[PDB]
Amino acid sequence: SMNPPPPETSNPNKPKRQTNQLQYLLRVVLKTLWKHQFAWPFQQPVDAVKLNLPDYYKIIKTPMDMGTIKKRLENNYYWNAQECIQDFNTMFTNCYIYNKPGDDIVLMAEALEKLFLQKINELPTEE
Numbered sequence: 651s652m653n654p655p656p657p658e659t660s661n662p663n664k665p666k667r668q669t670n671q672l673q674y675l676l677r678v679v680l681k682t683l684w685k686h687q688f689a690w691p692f693q694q695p696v697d698a699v700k701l702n703l704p705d706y707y708k709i710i711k712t713p714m715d716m717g718t719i720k721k722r723l724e725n726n727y728y729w730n731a732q733e734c735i736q737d738f739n740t741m742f743t744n745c746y747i748y749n750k751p752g753d754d755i756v757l758m759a760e761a762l763e764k765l766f767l768q769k770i771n772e773l774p775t776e777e
């Protein structure tokens with residue numbers, strides 16, 4: 651099987667806005683997670699071909715990853731901060747769905763998720 655196309659990251663027909671929460675999600679949340687020692691599996695769409703995971707996209711029907719999230723932020727694709735938060739949550743839950751408790755890849759995701767939740771708890775109030 652080939653890989654699916656990646657999630658959309660730009661749509662010139664969508665309206666765009668700047669908000670302090672979206673700025674924070676890029677400047678603080680995405681950039682901090684990106685540097686984490688276990689970030690690398692989550693920095694781009696899961697390449698099921700290269701990883702030899704022929705059933706990945708039979709099980710995961712709503713793919714998400716931090717490369718896509720980053721591009722969405724940088725393209726002003728999100729109108730609401732909640733959309734971006736949902737995408738991070740989709741990324742983590744996809745890993746937990748595909749895999750099993752205690753797998754190394756799951757514990758990697760859990761470490762990123764703990765950091766994510768700390769940074770989301772520090773999300774600024776809307777201006």
Ligand SMILES: CN1CC[C@H](c2c(O)cc(O)c3c(=O)cc(-c4ccccc4Cl)oc23)[C@H](O)C1
Nearest residue numbers: 690691692696697701702703744745748749755
């Ligand atoms: C050797 N083994 C390691 C785990 C890997 C694997 C899984 O078993 C299950 C997964 O859900 C993922 C994933 O989401 C991302 C990456 C990944 C992606 C890019 C670079 C490195 C890695 Cl580890 O790998 C995954 C695959 O079985 C090959």
